[PDB]
Design an enzyme around this catalytic site. Structure first.
Site, short mmCIF file in Angstrom:
data_model
loop_
_atom_site.label_atom_id
_atom_site.label_comp_id
_atom_site.label_asym_id
_atom_site.label_seq_id
_atom_site.Cartn_x
_atom_site.Cartn_y
_atom_site.Cartn_z
CD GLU A 66 14.50 29.47 4.51
OE1 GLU A 66 15.40 29.01 3.78
OE2 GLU A 66 14.47 30.66 4.89
CB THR A 88 -0.94 -0.01 1.21
OG1 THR A 88 -1.80 -1.15 1.14
CG2 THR A 88 -1.78 1.26 1.25
N1 LIG Z 1 9.78 1.19 11.09
C1 LIG Z 1 8.53 0.77 10.89
N2 LIG Z 1 8.20 0.15 9.70
C2 LIG Z 1 6.94 -0.28 9.48
C3 LIG Z 1 5.96 -0.11 10.45
N3 LIG Z 1 4.81 -0.63 9.98
C4 LIG Z 1 5.03 -1.11 8.74
N4 LIG Z 1 6.35 -0.92 8.42
C5 LIG Z 1 7.00 -1.30 7.15
O1 LIG Z 1 6.11 -2.10 6.39
C6 LIG Z 1 6.81 -3.09 5.67
C7 LIG Z 1 5.96 -4.35 5.53
O2 LIG Z 1 4.95 -4.18 4.56
P1 LIG Z 1 3.64 -3.30 4.89
O3 LIG Z 1 3.92 -1.82 4.76
O4 LIG Z 1 3.16 -3.65 6.27
O5 LIG Z 1 2.54 -3.77 3.81
P2 LIG Z 1 0.99 -3.82 4.24
O6 LIG Z 1 0.51 -2.43 4.58
O7 LIG Z 1 0.80 -4.77 5.39
O8 LIG Z 1 0.21 -4.34 2.94
P3 LIG Z 1 0.80 -5.51 2.01
O9 LIG Z 1 2.11 -5.04 1.43
O10 LIG Z 1 -0.17 -5.77 0.88
O11 LIG Z 1 1.03 -6.80 2.78
C8 LIG Z 1 8.09 -3.35 6.44
O12 LIG Z 1 9.20 -3.49 5.58
C9 LIG Z 1 8.26 -2.15 7.35
O13 LIG Z 1 9.45 -1.45 7.05
C10 LIG Z 1 6.28 0.51 11.65
O14 LIG Z 1 5.42 0.67 12.52
N5 LIG Z 1 7.57 0.95 11.87
#
Ligand SMILES: Nc1nc2c(ncn2[C@@H]2O[C@H](COP(=O)(O)OP(=O)(O)OP(=O)(O)O)[C@@H](O)[C@H]2O)c(=O)[nH]1
Ligand SMILES: Nc1nc2c(ncn2[C@@H]2O[C@H](COP(=O)(O)CP(=O)(O)OP(=O)(O)O)[C@@H](O)[C@H]2O)c(=O)[nH]1
Ligand SMILES: Nc1nc2c(ncn2[C@@H]2O[C@H](COP(=O)(O)CP(=O)(O)OP(=O)(O)O)[C@@H](O)[C@H]2O)c(=O)[nH]1
Ligand SMILES: Nc1nc2c(ncn2[C@@H]2O[C@H](COP(=O)(O)OP(=O)(O)OP(=O)(O)O)[C@@H](O)[C@H]2O)c(=O)[nH]1
EC number: 3.6.5.-
Lengths: 426, 427, 426, 427
Positions: free
Chosen positions: B244, B135
């Site tokens: 800036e 997403t």
């Molecule tokens: N640092 C950090 N990274 C996060 C966090 N939540 C999600 N991510 C990032 O999200 C990635 C995993 O995929 P998602 O963004 O969760 O994808 P999704 O929203 O679950 O949807 P799909 O990709 O379809 O499974 C990881 O590589 C993380 O880096 C968070 O709370 N903190």
């Protein structure tokens, strides 16, 4: 929102699915009658993804139970949660298959598919937007192997884009509870490899070996084996049933685990696994579970992973835990044992966590792995298929049902091809 | 001064619920939604004695949205802003941009425009997402192309979480980042990167917290993005607005990827035993292991950096600190921009969350520094991508969505077009 | 203004340094928590030369505690003034040296020097202008001898002009609390003789003999011995901590005591020294202290000064006193005992006085002497080194860490050279 | 600081059930398994309010394992650690190493590795066995060869029970010791020997116990091996870790057989009448008849010895004691290592078992001393072995297992290779 329809084909499918509703109903807090008595409000949001709401605060599951013998339907109806299922889904014929793949796929099953196809039209319309079908069957026998894989092809013709997840238990050389296992297995995998996008290969030998080493059960029946496999089916479909810090849909594992359309036979597993006599002498921390996660004797397949290399693996943890130590653990298994991982992928591990663990436990996880060790299982059954097929033994009954020996040779052409596919990426 | 935020994906909502946790505490806003000009740039006046946030939490999976709707900050956020999808992107840039994106972008774009109409001093935008997810990579690429053609001139802050060198949550996340960066290069004004493993050793070493979660992470990242916009909220001796950061960090239109680092990050018991001052924090942020992105700065050269402070900090000692840092030969600034310093001061000190691991400090500092230290990351991402691209692995899903090898080939050579000019300016 | 950074390498270095902050904090009037409760305003001026001002009227020392075992850091943290030290300076590894000079200098220490070199960069930048480093270690063992002398070499590469004062306690023949004393001692003095411009040779035999003759302690523990050596470290660095009629910097003694760069091994001593049962019967006047100052059994070295000749000595008095009778006393010791002084220098005595004595005492002093009697200590350990080295005993573990026997021969070439240097000017 | 123990054979489990009897009493651990950092090196924290021991009791005969499983310390030990075999070694080095060993070493080695994975400060190992038995000679030789190739660098303390000059439990025990010593020579870092008859006259003379059993013996041996690791458990003025005993006792890589002796060993009624002090115990341990190995020390010369004390013992009087012992001409230290003294002090005093014959003492001492006094034992073991080897007696079982005269001949000349250098360094 993202509903799932449960199908239960064959004698094993009805029994393995009956335990699936047993364990998930406990953590959801569903009465044996059908009402709700849960303790937390979080359990009430995503009940629609497997159940349908009814009057009087009552709930009913979307279980499509199908078989050719009425004995399995009567036993499941008299079960612990047998009354919760709706009677109209219990469609069944009179005569059994007799362990014949041709009867339940062309002649005997075709009389029943017209009755069940109209039922899924009703259930597929009642939900907001279906996500994927969670079927359960067994390659052994004729009913689940023949009629179960038949409706896979029919439903895929209707839904050429939805997910078709199946939890298929396969035969084994040492554990052979039926003489027609290789013929029923060889014809079924011809369709499962092309139609279904996901497949969880389960072996009965590992279910006996997993209960010897760590559970220490002195008299484990079929009900004990069902508790292991039912927990894996529940663990995979937990992120879209409760919220978490990183929720992974069933299709999100498909995109990560299926690099090619046929290469989708997965290795299921579960942790923690400890006996009642040694539950107190074990640490439930993440370093303790992760070492037992990728253990050589942990998964539900008899094939040794040391004889192959993991192309991709997943560990959907479940329970309140710190994800910092998780990532170091998944880093160590791929770095310390890099010889047992493919060099042409930088990272072979998928991650996912949930906040609400099951009842009685604090932290847990479930394993899903697509590896090259499975080719030892497909080739040994092919030798069993090739040994009997070359003399045309036990094929005259198939020809009576309008079959031909050419389709058996064509199924062998699919069998010897997919084992060589694993040999390419090994 | 006003600015509209947008959060996308699983990465955005954990930044959303965390970063907005301290803003309502900064302005004395209770969680119920009620208690003169400082909160105007992030909170509007809802008739009388009530506020509403200037944000949109879009996400394909509603597993996070219903949690926020059933959470504790229910009465704060507007129920229309919590947009919900139908099904997740499955770590697919193609599915989150083309199939699922088109049937919902018409609602999101109209929602952004009607909220932007009543604005008068809309300076720009800031996006929270992550290219490693589905997403955050697919849907964010759709709106960025579609709003840039509409507005264009306004600024944009892409707060993207990148993959680590060895740590990685998924396996298809290189395919998500390689495609979306081809679209993000020409339309994104400036993108501040964040690394996931870079936070792990920070709290382990400095904060000595050996079992934190994302809630500890996003509380720090939410504090970082609060300090960069703190000049617009409260008064300052040397204020800096959103425009800036467009000029003093982006010397070339394609080289728009600055690093980030923040200090001080000290625990409760450790804060009293350590002296808080301007000297050590100005040295601590330039320390390479004290960064939010694991990339060696010594492998390249610095283009320009901005020293934005907080709390009661006089303007003289900060000038002596950067003057002393100029004399240190352990670092090396590039000859193309030697005077790449931008000092900034704010009177309002850093806040503190109740129960949080971060300690109260009378002064703080945040850093955005452009350098050629990121080219090793793009080189690493290209090399690991070539291992999977050779075997054509994890490709049948994208072409199963509708894509093909052509745009994948255009995405590969685009990084090669980015590798050459990073090395050219590094001379 | 003229700041000093305290380093504490080895187990003895952490313990000897913990008592150094114990005694000087009392005369400065520093709370155990860190606040100030002194009685005189004069104590507040030169607090910056060893401490850093902090919020809430709190003060924190620049103590760089380093060791390879975590036991010494936990014990010092639970000490009387353990909490006043800052936590980030407590850097420490996991595995100890096991009394191996090769491990803590090449392999085990090199993993730790990168962590402490960045810490001293922070403390060196916080001060206005560092004067010199006050390190504390022990030749016995591997941690303080191996890792302690390593950063002596690294810091001298950074500061080729600053002062490097070290309080090194050496082994002895009768008091042998470790089998690897001569090998660890022979390799350490090869670097200390070339790098450090000042060195205070302390012997445990004198610390046992000094408490028998005059203190009459019937059960003197390590805490009793630390009070003697800690007072000498405080007495030398007192003129640049309080004002006086003639203040002598740490470098002003080095210019007067070090006529040649390697010839810098000094003889430490302290006065007054009286038991609790005879404190009233002794006179606290300068003629009483001066006779006890140059007594044969007073210094902290086992070698008899009667077997050598003082090349130069210093007596930094401390407390309100008349300096007229002081100079008459230093004139008498060099004139009455002129045979025990070199004829090729007219005056072998240095003088310095301070106004504010320590708590509990009225007048005191500290002895620093470079004499030819120390060659008896360097040759006997060389005989211990020569006896075991000729059979290559206890060297195979050194070779495992990348060492060679040639460096041991090169260390012997430095050992037999410096003892002959003392023989030249004797 | 962590260290994993392993017990092999009948000799190991009697040392196991006895030595672990006082450790749980030292740390206040009840026998049920429950009651901050002293117990970490031998007991782990199992979640909340429960412990588990860091030991593996392997044995081919399960006649001892079922006793411990049905004993009083059932709730303490992990049931997985109590490994069971199928059939005993029959005092055959060949059967306990090749046939029965190979079909169970794959399970034992994997069990050792998974427990060592979670360790962080694993200093080394300590093995309990006896070469005079079958399982203690055969199976111990298998794992020591198989783990040394894996780990190698880590230290190992072999606590082996040796045969006596005239006393002996079996007849084939020279054949068991002569074979296993050929393999134990190159891989075992240091092996502290114990003699069976040497304990007999100790309790008879000093403790005046005229009908004890192994339970009295192993309680003393368990106290001896508790004192050598006592510096790592509790704090001390002069601590020594596991690597200290590897360097200051093994000057040559093949001469790694120090003697052992312990004092004071005084009964209950005799303790109140005898004055406990540092002088008599420091003289008592150097007394030849007061040793755990019946070998004349005056027939050779001492290389180096360590004086590790217990309880409230000041460091000064111990220095005077070793100084006086140096002046005694009744002993003679070798000129190759005259300064072979290593003092050590610990604050935690010796413990006492309820109902045991050993009395409470405020101070104690344990000794490990390398010397050339063991060469007469190996010379005796070679002479008695030559009587049976000449007639080829008790050989048809070993070749019946699979062995042959070659390794038996290589084992004979190996002691001859050990006889020459002990006499050479003895000069
Ligand atoms: N640092 C950090 N990274 C996060 C966090 N939540 C999600 N991510 C990032 O999200 C990635 C995993 O995929 P998602 O963004 O969760 O994808 P999704 O929203 O679950 O949807 P799909 O990709 O379809 O499974 C990881 O590589 C993380 O880096 C968070 O709370 N903190
Ligand atoms: N993991 C499980 N496997 C099962 C279970 N029940 C059976 N099986 C296995 O599946 C094999 C065949 O599956 P079935 O029991 O369903 C035979 P089916 O009902 O399809 O035909 P008929 O009973 O003859 O009408 C069977 O031999 C078992 O190896 C079960 O409850 N759990
Ligand atoms: N003057 C003092 N000498 C001490 C003190 N403590 C120890 N020592 C002497 O220094 C000798 C060795 O120094 P250490 O105690 O530091 C041994 P180290 O910690 O470096 O190695 P490990 O403890 O084995 O990790 C030691 O044998 C004593 O003779 C002390 O507090 N004061
Ligand atoms: N000192 C002492 N020695 C013991 C003890 N238990 C066993 N042993 C030794 O064990 C040897 C006898 O062989 P075992 O160890 O019992 O051999 P096993 O385990 O019975 O197996 P097999 O050798 O096949 O018969 C004797 O020589 C003893 O030295 C004990 O409690 N104390």
């Amino acid at each position: 929102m993202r509903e799932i329809v449960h199908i239960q084909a064959g004698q094993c499918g009805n029994q393995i699915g009956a335990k699936f509703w047993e364990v998930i109903s406990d953590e959801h807090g569903i009465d044996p009658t059908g009402s709700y008595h849960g303790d937390s409000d979080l359990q009430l949001e995503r009940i629609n993804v497997y159940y349908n709401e009814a009057a009087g605060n009552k709930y009913v599951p979307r279980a499509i139970l199908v078989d050719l013998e009425p004995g399995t339907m009567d036993s499941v109806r008299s079960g612990p949660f047998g009354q919760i299922f709706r009677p109209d889904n219990f469609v069944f014929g009179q005569s059994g298959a007799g362990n014949n793949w041709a009867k339940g796929h062309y002649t005997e099953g075709a009389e029943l598919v017209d009755s069940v196809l109209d039922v899924v039209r009703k259930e597929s319309e009642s939900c907001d937007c279906l996500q994927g079908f969670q079927l359960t069957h067994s390659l052994g026998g004729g009913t689940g192997s023949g009629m179960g894989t038949l409706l896979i092809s029919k439903i895929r013709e209707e839904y050429p884009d939805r997910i078709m997840n199946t939890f298929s238990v396969m035969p084994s050389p040492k554990v052979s509870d039926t003489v027609v296992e290789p013929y029923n297995a060889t014809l079924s995998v011809h369709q499962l490899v092309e139609n279904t996008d996901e497949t969880y290969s389960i072996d009965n030998e590992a279910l006996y070996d997993i209960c010897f080493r760590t559970l220490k059960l002195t008299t484990p029946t079929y009900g004990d084996l069902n508790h292991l496999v039912s927990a894996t089916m529940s663990g995979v479909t937990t992120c879209l049933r409760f919220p978490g810090q990183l929720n992974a849909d069933l299709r999100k594992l498909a995109v990560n685990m299926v690099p090619f359309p046929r290469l989708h036979f997965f290795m299921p597993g579960f942790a923690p696994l400890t006996s009642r006599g040694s539950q107190q002498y074990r640490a439930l921390t993440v370093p303790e579970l992760t070492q037992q996660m990728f253990d050589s004797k942990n998964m539900m397949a008899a094939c040794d992973p040391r004889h192959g290399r993991y192309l991709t693996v997943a560990a959907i943890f479940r329970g309140r835990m710190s994800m910092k130590e998780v990532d170091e653990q998944m880093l160590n298994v791929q770095n310390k044992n890099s010889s047992y991982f493919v060099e042409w992928i930088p990272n072979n591990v998928k991650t996912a966590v949930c906040d609400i663990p099951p009842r009685g436990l604090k932290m847990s996880a479930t394993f899903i792995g697509n590896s090259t060790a499975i080719q030892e299982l497909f080739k040994r059954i092919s030798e069993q298929f090739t040994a009997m097929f070359r003399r045309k033994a036990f094929l005259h009954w198939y020809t009576g049902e309008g079959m031909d020996e050419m389709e058996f040779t064509e199924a062998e052409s699919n069998m010897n091809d997919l084992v060589s596919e694993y040999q390419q990426y090994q | 001064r006003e600015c509209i935020s947008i959060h996308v994906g699983q990465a955005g909502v954990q930044i959303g619920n965390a970063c907005w946790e301290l803003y309502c505490l900064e302005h004395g806003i209770q969680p119920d939604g009620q208690m003169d000009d400082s909160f105007n740039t992030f909170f509007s006046e809802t008739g009388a004695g009530k506020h509403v946030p200037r944000a949109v939490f879009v996400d394909l999976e509603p597993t996070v949205i219903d949690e926020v709707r059933t959470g504790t900050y229910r009465q704060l956020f507007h129920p229309e802003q919590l947009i919900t999808g139908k099904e997740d992107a499955a770590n697919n840039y193609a599915r989150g941009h083309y199939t699922i994106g088109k049937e919902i972008i018409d609602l999101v774009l109209d929602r952004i425009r009607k909220l932007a109409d009543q604005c008068t001093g809309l300076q720009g935008f800031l996006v929270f997402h992550s290219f490693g997810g589905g997403t955050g990579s697919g849907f964010t690429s759709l709106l960025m192309e579609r709003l840039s053609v509409d507005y264009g001139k306004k600024s944009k802050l892409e707060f993207s979480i990148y993959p680590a060198p060895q740590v990685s949550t998924a396996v298809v996340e290189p395919y998500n980042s390689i495609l979306t960066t081809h679209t993000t290069l020409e339309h994104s004004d400036c993108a501040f990167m964040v690394d996931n493993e870079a936070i792990y050793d920070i709290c382990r070493r400095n904060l000595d917290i050996e079992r934190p979660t994302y809630t500890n992470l996003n509380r720090l990242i939410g504090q970082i993005v609060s300090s960069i916009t703190a000049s617009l909220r409260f008064d300052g001796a040397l204020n800096v607005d959103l425009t800036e950061f467009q000029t003093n960090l982006v010397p070339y239109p394609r080289i728009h990827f600055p690093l980030a680092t923040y200090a001080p990050v000290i625990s409760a018991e450790k804060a009293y035993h350590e002296q808080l001052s301007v000297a050590e924090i100005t040295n601590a942020c330039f320390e390479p292991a004290n960064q939010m992105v694991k990339c060696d700065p010594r492998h390249g050269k610095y283009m320009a950096c901005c020293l934005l402070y907080r709390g009661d900090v006089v303007p003289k000692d900060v000038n002596a600190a950067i003057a002393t840092i100029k004399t240190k030969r352990t670092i090396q600034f590039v000859d193309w921009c030697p005077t790449g310093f931008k000092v900034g001061i704010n009177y309002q000190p850093p806040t503190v969350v109740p129960g949080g691991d971060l300690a109260k400090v009378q002064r703080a500092v945040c850093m955005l520094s452009n350098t050629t230290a990121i080219a090793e990351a793009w080189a690493r991402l290209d090399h690991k991508f070539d291992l999977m691209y050779a075997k054509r692995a994890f490709v049948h899903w994208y072409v199963g969505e509708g894509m093909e090898e052509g745009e994948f080939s255009e995405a590969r050579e685009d990084m090669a077009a980015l590798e050459k000019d990073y090395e050219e300016v590094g001379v």
